[model samples]
Target: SAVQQKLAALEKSSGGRLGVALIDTADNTQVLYRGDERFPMCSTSKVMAAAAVLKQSETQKQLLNQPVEIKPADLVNYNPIAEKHVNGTMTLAELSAAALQYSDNTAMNKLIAQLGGPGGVTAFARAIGDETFRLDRTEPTLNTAIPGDPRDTTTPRAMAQTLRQLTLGHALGETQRAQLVTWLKGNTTGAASIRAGLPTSWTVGDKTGSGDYGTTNDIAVIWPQGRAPLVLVTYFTQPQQNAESRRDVLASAARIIAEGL
Candidate 1:
């Protein structure tokens, strides 16, 4: 397939592992490459964290409006919003935005805490019919992206599928599903990736993750004009010191997938 060769050329020249999966839910068209291999999820795990919280809220009812206090000790590196609110309170709704749209580390930590811990997040994945998504640590620690370690990792297929389940599937309540999409569409970190490659006519909602060992990833739910929705996941990594992830790599891969579809 032209899509396969284009993806291979990019993977070959980049000297990094690239995993991609694109699904057009309308017709169930799919393009997958290295989709089964594990890659550090980095902050992308927050999507699951948020989903777990939203899932709980369906029964708890007050979970979204409930306020949680933030302490000075709870803050983590990369926290911008949480840092400002130390010793203050933020509703679960606010924290979800911090973690999902702004990528605030402390907000994510608090959200994970709401889930009970890394184990809770893992359990949520299993309950949702996702076998490859896993979280073994919190915040900065999970960002370690150890070369061959499977901890805090997910496959491209799993990531894309889970996102689809939450966004377009019945995994989340209607209100919470809309909230997730709103946050992703307003995300501050995805301008350089899949979002950049897409035409303006297409609508996009996305989440991005950056971590050690050159790990950078983006997962998106896209609406291509008159077509059915598409879910795309791109995970890139290389085990080189100080190696930086290239957003262009993701953009090109997305472009290729879009063109192919």
Candidate 2:
């Protein structure tokens, strides 16, 4: 396939390991490359955390409305929005927005705690039929991105399939799905990755994660003009050095997927 060939070339030129999964949810058509291999999930795990919170709120209606106090110690690096609200309080919705739209580490940690920590998010994924998704730690520590460790890791295929279910399948109720989509669409962190690869007229909602050893990832639901949605996941890592993660590599992979489709 031209897409596979192009992706191979992209991987070669980028000088890093790349895992990609593209799913046309309308028909279950797929394109995959190293899709089953684990990659550091980084902040991308927040999406699952947010979904778990939303799922729990379905039964415990007050979950979303409860005030969550943000203490000084809750603050973590890369917590832009959380820092501003420290020593204050925010509803679950506020925290979800901060975590998804701004990649707020503190907000994510709070959500993890609310869900009973990392295992809670893992359990949520398991309940939803995703066996490969796992979250073993909270922010900063989770971003360590140690080579070959399975903790806090997920596969491109599992994540893409999981996204399809969460965004367009039965895993989330209508209201919960819409809320998650809204937060994702409003995300301010994915401009240079998957979003950058598509036509501006096409709509996409995504979450991005960057971490040590050049790990970068993006998971998205993209809607093209006159076509059904596509769930895409891209995970890139270069363990040779602690260089910066490459947005261009991710964008190029997304473009290959989009054009090939």
TM for every model, in the order presented, reads 0.98, 0.98
Runs with alpha carbons beyond 4 Å of true place in candidate 2: none
Worst 10 residues of 1 by lDDT: 239-248
Expressed as tens digits, the lDDT of each residue in 30-122 for candidate 1 is: 789998999999988999999999999999999899999999888878888888888889999999999999899999998889999999999
Per-residue accuracy of model 2 over 1-261 as CA lDDT, tens digit each: 889999999999988899999999778898999998999999899999999999998888788888899899778788899888888999999999999999999999999999998999999999999999999998989988888999999999999999989998879888899999999999999999999998899899999999998988999999898999999999999866477989899999999998867
Candidate with best lDDT? 2
Error of 1 at 171 (Å): 0.5
lDDT of 2 at 21: 96
